[PDB]
Amino acid sequence: ATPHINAEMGDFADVVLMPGDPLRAKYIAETFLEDAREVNNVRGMLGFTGTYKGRKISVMGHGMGIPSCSIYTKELITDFGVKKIIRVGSCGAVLPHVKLRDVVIGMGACTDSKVNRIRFKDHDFAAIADFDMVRNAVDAAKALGIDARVGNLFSADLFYSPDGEMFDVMEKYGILGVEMEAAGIYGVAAEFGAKALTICTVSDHIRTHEQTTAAERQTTFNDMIKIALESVLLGDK
Template sequence: MSEGNHDVFHLGLNRSDLEGAEIALIPGDPGRVPKIATHLENARDLANTREYRSMLGFSGETPVLVMSTGIGGPSAAIAVEELALLGVKRFLRIGTTGAIQPHIEASDVVITTAAVRMDGASRHIAPQEYPAVADFHMVRRLVAAAERIGARYHLGVTASSDTFYQGQGRKDSFRKGFVHRELANKIEELQNLNVLSYEMEAGTVLTQTSAYGLGGACISGVLVNRTRAEFPDAAVIGETVLKTIQVAIASLKED
């Protein structure tokens, strides 16, 4: 990383650190950054501050930034804001998700076309009526990549919740089963609206990128189907994360 003052407040990065990168792969987990970067060429560390760990690599001659955003919309919104200030134009979230439709299996991938905005951060960017939609061209590339490598995928709407427990209808929180009335039957409502899964960042990222005239997309590995289980099989996690990364990286090579 270059010395001197940083160009943005939180990320520990200068514009020159990115070497002209206009695409960012943004997982939530800092530990997932090197797992993604290993699929790029000549990857190197940039910074590691707060929840934002960053590395730079190349897909052919194209510089690609990999940077974690932490959990949830507020920290993801900071990441998108500051990376946009540094010249990034396309944001591909690589995450995990819990399916709520019975036909989706653990280890499948979900490619988000739009997100239900159950977050708070996106409301600071655009009014609630504004849709959280993915960039068509990025979605098309993800679909083509999944088909090329033989990954089973599902295309559709996901729900972005600010909370992992109450907002996603889990009954194993501290208050053992209590969810206030606005959320008590939310999972059934979303299932009936053909929402595929819960995650925590796409609503913010897609609202923000659309409102800013940037490109945004989200691919998530399915760790568990919540119509059958609440906790993922440990053996499935590594396989699912790897498959999701492979599809995301492969999408960079699509014309």
């Protein structure tokens, strides 16, 4: 066990899906995994392990922010033999053409944080996902009849920013989705030699700040989970 995870080697699959909300990990295990069992509960960060079409899969929340998810992903990789981390969350949109419910894939992730500069001798480290994982996700989505956008995400330290001028900048440079973990998870994956990918569903459009129907929203979120789970199967081949 670690100070944040009360499990032992073997308790997690070598692939872990990670939502920000611990209650969403439980929701994913309940909805898509067969014979899922809770393998962690410290600080209430629920983790589960079960099978998806016979494949051993794990899903655990990572909390909000780079500092939070950096702790969990780091421990999964070094102490639980986890090779892949697939973040499945929500994000806000700044581009007029990026619509509510669009599925975004973060090939790269820009950031507000100083963590990668601390890692990269104060220079610019391009926080990127694992290419194969990106490709598997794109292909899985195509098979589901879904067209995911692949580009940059922006991982913020302040959900409530003081200088609202950053949104124009994000939009100017083509940022697809705004969230809070991608850049940190990619930094961890690179530092400890593992593979990661962040997929998000647009739950808010900053240009119009909205949400829309709930049934349709829940549908897209599930497609996103489906895309994540199906993508690991393509990777297995």
